[PDB]
Design an enzyme around this catalytic site. Structure first.
Site, mmCIF file in Angstrom:
data_model
loop_
_atom_site.group_PDB
_atom_site.id
_atom_site.type_symbol
_atom_site.label_atom_id
_atom_site.label_comp_id
_atom_site.label_asym_id
_atom_site.label_seq_id
_atom_site.Cartn_x
_atom_site.Cartn_y
_atom_site.Cartn_z
ATOM 1 C CG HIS A 100 -0.574 0.184 2.485
ATOM 2 N ND1 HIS A 100 -0.200 1.421 2.988
ATOM 3 C CD2 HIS A 100 -0.492 -0.734 3.473
ATOM 4 C CE1 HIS A 100 0.143 1.207 4.251
ATOM 5 N NE2 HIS A 100 -0.013 -0.077 4.590
ATOM 6 N N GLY B 46 2.188 5.940 10.142
ATOM 7 C CA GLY B 46 3.601 5.901 9.777
ATOM 8 C C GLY B 46 4.324 4.665 10.294
ATOM 9 C CB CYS C 105 2.501 0.990 7.432
ATOM 10 S SG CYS C 105 0.824 1.447 7.925
HETATM 11 N N1 LIG Z 1 -2.488 3.133 6.247
HETATM 12 C C1 LIG Z 1 -3.802 2.789 6.817
HETATM 13 C C2 LIG Z 1 -3.647 2.359 8.295
HETATM 14 O O1 LIG Z 1 -4.406 1.533 8.787
HETATM 15 N N2 LIG Z 1 -2.639 2.974 8.957
HETATM 16 C C3 LIG Z 1 -2.258 2.762 10.295
HETATM 17 C C4 LIG Z 1 -1.574 1.633 10.740
HETATM 18 N N3 LIG Z 1 -1.276 1.369 12.020
HETATM 19 C C5 LIG Z 1 -1.677 2.243 12.931
HETATM 20 C C6 LIG Z 1 -2.383 3.436 12.637
HETATM 21 C C7 LIG Z 1 -2.842 4.331 13.632
HETATM 22 C C8 LIG Z 1 -3.537 5.455 13.292
HETATM 23 C C9 LIG Z 1 -3.808 5.740 11.963
HETATM 24 C C10 LIG Z 1 -3.390 4.898 10.972
HETATM 25 C C11 LIG Z 1 -2.670 3.714 11.275
HETATM 26 C C12 LIG Z 1 -4.660 4.075 6.834
HETATM 27 C C13 LIG Z 1 -6.128 3.753 7.017
HETATM 28 O O2 LIG Z 1 -6.630 2.869 5.986
HETATM 29 C C14 LIG Z 1 -5.871 1.745 5.753
HETATM 30 C C15 LIG Z 1 -6.537 0.683 5.161
HETATM 31 C C16 LIG Z 1 -5.829 -0.452 4.815
HETATM 32 C C17 LIG Z 1 -4.467 -0.492 5.037
HETATM 33 CL CL1 LIG Z 1 -3.572 -1.918 4.583
HETATM 34 C C18 LIG Z 1 -3.792 0.558 5.627
HETATM 35 C C19 LIG Z 1 -4.501 1.686 6.029
#
Ligand SMILES: N[C@@]1(C(=O)Nc2cncc3ccccc23)CCOc2ccc(Cl)cc21
Ligand SMILES: N[C@@]1(C(=O)Nc2cncc3ccccc23)CCOc2ccc(Cl)cc21
Lengths: 306, 299
Positions: free
Chosen positions: A41, A143, A145
């Protein structure tokens, strides 16, 4: 003496963390030999997240679109390929700090250490367990990820988790290092939710054996139970069924403490019925399920405090 | 989201751990520049000056991985032995030796035979012990914090007390607490709860969306301190109130407003509820630990 939630030393993993940037998205990558692994992603532009066609998005990218930074050094991307939900970026430099490693897929109940990272820089280390509903109760902000989970039994790093997302209940979902998600999750911003979670019974029993090893027996009773009667009671408290494999796995702790597995099951049944009555077990007022039988053996003395 | 007991990344400290053997005793040492620091009880009513004068440099066997370092000098500083070696550690990070106060937290890199085994976070209790997880051979394992790129070494493990808690020194060899490094009757004093840390953890719970314990009430600092004394909680000072200022501003809950919540929790319990997955009031997160974890600071 003592019993702590103990993570593996993170040094071998810290020397693998890098920052990966594609357009406006920045996340973490794992640099092993000449490949940087990261969530696919990183190629999505937020709007894409509802129904991304990763193959269509990736074909429009060239190697030079991926900016990889290891400390204050830019690595050059010389190839890219997608394997399930992971992007593998071939770089022109092999990581000189690459430890001895393996990619392992874990089962629910298994524990691992998480090296939480932001911008390719490690922030902290903590211990986690793969919940029965395939989520992890982590501590991750935006961030994070690409941060990884691992174990280091015998100087070899076994990478088992790569962080991808946070679900609406605040729990986290990710993949193994081959990009296969744990659980029925997808890397899309579609409506997704963690299923009802349950307590990891075999881990609670392991932690009760850890309490006996450290000198505490207050919770034991004169009763035993059959495996089936234990499961019939335990299911009523949202506990995972205990299998014959679990009973076998607890054999060593049973032999060290002299408490049969089914006798420890009777103690657990009673604890579930009565609660702790103002008492604690290893500094906790709740039954702890994030220590496996292997973790207890790793940390605890081989001699019980009789 | 989420809140875990998080330790600092241990890599900078792992590259400093060595094995020190003197006779039949084996423990861990910290190799910084050309000096290996370790508990002086590796030489063992002990007269440490008398026991040390009978030793030569070659009696101390120091091993860094699969390499034997040669000891070229030795001296004692309080309860720490400083072994001068011929090789400076090429992995020596930027570091400082700091002495911490009760209530402050640090990461411990537990080691056996000069090899790191695990990392965990803990706090210096008000009774100067730490509730660590250490077995025989863990002596010389160290506690530290990281600020930017600088490791601040604050603890060196020496012993386990009869209640299973641990005692040690700063890196200048001064014990934390009224302990001595010998086999004699010693005990941890009655411990108390670190009030400022419990309040910090309640702010962390509010930031993470756990607000059931909040109430409309406030209290004076003097009235709260009468309640703290009753439940074996450390007194809360104006410095503690000042330190909690940022968390108070972020959540909109005044520090004394959070004190009325804590007073009600002490007088009534949790009533079957939990806060951040705990049925007990957690006191091993400082206000700085809460801010750092809820902001993603890196090293
Ligand atoms: N990059 C996303 C995410 O969950 N990102 C975060 C990860 N860990 C923790 C987070 C805490 C707060 C905000 C964001 C976080 C943003 C939200 O939509 C999706 C949907 C699917 C996937 Cl695979 C990734 C995301
Ligand atoms: N080496 C001693 C010790 O406490 N060492 C341990 C440390 N941590 C944990 C231990 C767990 C079990 C057994 C031993 C442990 C053994 C007992 O006598 C003394 C007396 C003074 C001093 Cl400074 C040290 C010790």
């Amino acid at each position: 003496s003592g019993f702590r939630k103990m993570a593996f030393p993170s040094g071998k993993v810290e020397g693998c963390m890098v920052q990966v940037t594609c357009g406006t998205t920045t996340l973490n990558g794992l640099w092993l030999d000449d490949v940087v692994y990261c969530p696919r992603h990183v190629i999505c532009t937020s709007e894409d997240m509802l129904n991304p066609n990763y193959e269509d998005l990736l074909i429009r990218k060239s190697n030079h679109n991926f900016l990889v930074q290891a400390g204050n050094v830019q690595l050059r991307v010389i190839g890219h390929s997608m394997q399930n939900c992971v992007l593998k970026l071939k770089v022109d430099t092999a990581n000189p700090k690459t430890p001895k490693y393996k990619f392992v897929r874990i089962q629910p109940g298994q524990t691992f250490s998480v090296l939480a990272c932001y911008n390719g820089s490690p922030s902290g280390v903590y211990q986690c367990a793969m919940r029965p509903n395939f989520t992890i109760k982590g501590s991750f902000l935006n961030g994070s990820c690409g941060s990884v989970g691992f174990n280091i039994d015998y100087d070899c790093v076994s990478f088992c988790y790569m962080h991808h997302m946070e679900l609406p209940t605040g729990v986290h979902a990710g993949t193994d290092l081959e990009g296969n998600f744990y659980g029925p999750f997808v890397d899309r911003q579609t409506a997704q939710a963690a299923g009802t979670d349950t307590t990891i019974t075999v881990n609670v029993l392991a932690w009760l054996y850890a309490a006996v090893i450290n000198g505490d027996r207050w919770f034991l009773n004169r009763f035993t139970t059959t495996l089936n009667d234990f499961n019939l009671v335990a299911m009523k408290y949202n506990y995972e069924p205990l299998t014959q494999d679990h009973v076998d796995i607890l054999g060593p702790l049973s032999a060290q403490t002299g408490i049969a597995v089914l006798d420890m099951c009777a103690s657990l049944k009673e604890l579930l019925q009565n609660g702790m009555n103002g008492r604690t077990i290893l500094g906790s007022a709740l039954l702890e399920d994030e220590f496996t039988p292997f973790d207890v053996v790793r940390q605890c003395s081989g001699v019980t405090f009789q």
